[PDB]
């Protein structure tokens, strides 16, 4: 092969209060979204430079937006720094803008299947879901007429897009600027989470909504993370890019109230040294991941009762109606006779009832396990 | 065994340091100028050494790490322990689950300045009972009461010890206000994450020891932030008897996003709450010292600290007639000296001055030293 500058081999070894891997004997977790790789040694540098051995409150460098606009400038679209805001992550960044910018009883408008946690901050923060659901039929598809008639909705206040879509791993282009000019027109604050943006396997781009033409340009929200990118979830490090300066100043306010405005120890060099240093840690990382998909992709086409996906964005959604059988229990059942643990559908909504989330950023010996004690789980069902 | 006398050199993105002039010397904001605990900076390099930083959960040896800690005090049953990223973060969620908009919540002025910013923020109303100040300030309980009984107060936020005026108040005086607050329906939001730091050996009730009348109504909030000067690990603890409540702001805590720790809270605090102790009684002799050298070196008799029994010296330089804040900008400007100015604690607070005392006595020297010259050149 061709010699990998960094290791992506060896899983890493985590404390027992890990979610990934805390709590039996030969088991196989794959269903929660976090790697098995160690980050890049250029951003364990930065850290290990930082703990200074006092770690009292931080401020925002300038030098945070400048790497993140470079960032976003040399992998997909250069923002600029003052569109710039820290906060301490994706989802909490959602959760204060709903409180924000929406009142109580307002409607949040989703495309199930769609993160679970999208559900959990809508609803928790006393907003009501609504969904233009995905429609399925290998692909899934944006019923745009139903799209459109919920943003007109009055109580329709914002739009929560995944850009790229977890968990069909779907990448939007020019479907991103009707999807700002239709929220726009309405006047529908649209919110474009691109946690997943620089995981496209295909060397198709992420379309940051951010860029959209100023007619639209001002009803925007793009948030990044290095988070899902470099395997640095508990970092708590994002960054919402608002062009509109009004949205973005009430964003910032709202951060800080709700306590998530203020970075933590290791959010600001940790990322800094990410998007500074980590494109060629990336690039190799993705080379892996496309090996194990292909792999994967491959091995169940020895189980042909399942479907996969066409995905374009690590995370494999895979069809399993065929079992006759609900994902919940399946992936119950499945962990009892074979140890692997792989996430149910159920709780994306739309259709996903029918379908299993399997994560592979693990290196390749865990995805052959992992698929064959998938094939292992569905050959007991038929015997 | 410790160090105390060399000051941490921070990266340029310090509040209390980055962006200073030449020759300024920061003592306004909460933080100490020492070095961690190594225990704590040990388990810090552990942890990276992981190399993979994913998801954590909180697990029960952080709740029993905080049962243990509070040896120091007065021991929270450990499922009543709620992780959460901060103490005024918790203060804010706490604010929007309990109380509605137009709802007013009870402070005692002066008080720290943070507690008007999460109330107010999520449009809510201050109401204070204020401390009657005659060097020292005490509490008129007949209007704390009428207070509490108006139906529009819904919440107390509590300081304990009471910052910025370093008083833990009495097992008396702790429970009296949790007695008062549950007949009246009122939840008490008891912030002690200055607890760990009561200088005499005079301890703090937590309003979570009160007893069954009234633990029903109590929350009281601890974290290692300013005891082992770690403000930006973001990790706290919110200790919550009742089961209802303890359940609801615990939602409230995940919805705001303050619920989860991230790569390093959950094994530094079990490093401070399990083997910080010797590292704190240490310093907490540095702070009497600079305590004891402080007020000696003032008695500036046109300055008076007042008697503090828990770092930050809150002196009164009513004798000068300046407002504080007008003060603590002419201080920083021929001096470099800079400290906190009274008027943002509402109260009397524009009569007073909050000096920040962890740091190693030389700077205290040098701090003192600016103080008294600055107090000269405004009568010549
Ligand atoms: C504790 C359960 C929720 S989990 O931390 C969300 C995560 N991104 C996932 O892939 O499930």
Not at 123 to 132: A, D, F, H, K, L
Not at 251 to 278: H, K, Q, R, V
Request: charged fraction near 25%; glycine fraction near 6%.
């Amino acid at each position: 092969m061709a010699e990998k500058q960094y290791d992506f081999t060896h899983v890493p070894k985590r404390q027992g209060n890990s979610i990934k891997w805390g709590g039996k004997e030969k088991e196989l977790p794959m269903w929660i979204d976090e790697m098995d790789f160690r980050i890049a040694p250029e951003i364990m540098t930065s850290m290990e430079e930082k703990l200074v051995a006092a770690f009292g409150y931080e401020s925002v460098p300038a030098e945070y937006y400048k790497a993140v606009a470079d960032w976003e400038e040399i992998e997909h679209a250069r923002p600029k720094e003052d569109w710039c805001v820290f906060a301490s992550g994706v989802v909490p960044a959602i959760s204060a803008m709903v409180r924000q910018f929406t009142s109580p009883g307002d409607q949040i408008l989703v495309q199930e299947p769609v993160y679970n946690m999208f559900y959990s901050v809508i609803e928790g923060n006393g907003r009501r879901v609504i969904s233009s659901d995905l429609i399925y039929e290998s692909k899934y598809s944006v019923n745009w007429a139903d799209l459109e008639e919920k943003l007109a909705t009055p109580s329709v206040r914002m739009m929560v897009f995944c850009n790229p879509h977890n968990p069909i791993g779907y990448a939007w282009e020019e479907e991103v600027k009707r999807i700002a000019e239709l929220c726009a027109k309405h006047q529908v604050l649209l919110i474009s989470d691109e946690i997943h943006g620089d995981l496209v396997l295909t060397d198709e781009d992420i379309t940051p909504a951010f860029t959209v033409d100023w007619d639209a340009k001002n009803w925007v929200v793009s948030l990044i993370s290095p988070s899902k990118t470099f395997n640095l979830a508990a970092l708590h490090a994002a960054c919402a890019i608002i062009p509109n300066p009004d949205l973005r100043a009430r964003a910032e306010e709202s951060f800080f109230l709700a306590g998530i405005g203020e970075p933590n120890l290791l959010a600001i060099p940790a990322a800094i040294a990410a998007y500074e240093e980590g494109h060629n840690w990336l690039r190799e990382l993705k080379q892996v991941l496309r090996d194990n998909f292909a792999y994967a992709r491959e091995f169940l086409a020895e189980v042909p009762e399942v479907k996969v996906l066409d995905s374009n964005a690590y995370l494999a959604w895979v069809d399993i109606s065929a079992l006759g059988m609900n994902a919940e229990d399946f992936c119950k059942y499945l962990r009892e006779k074979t140890g692997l643990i792989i996430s149910a559908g159920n709780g994306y909504r739309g259709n996903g009832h029918e379908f299993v989330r399997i994560n592979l950023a693990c290196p390749k010996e865990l995805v052959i396990d992992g698929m064959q004690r998938l094939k292992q789980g569905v050959l007991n069902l038929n015997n």
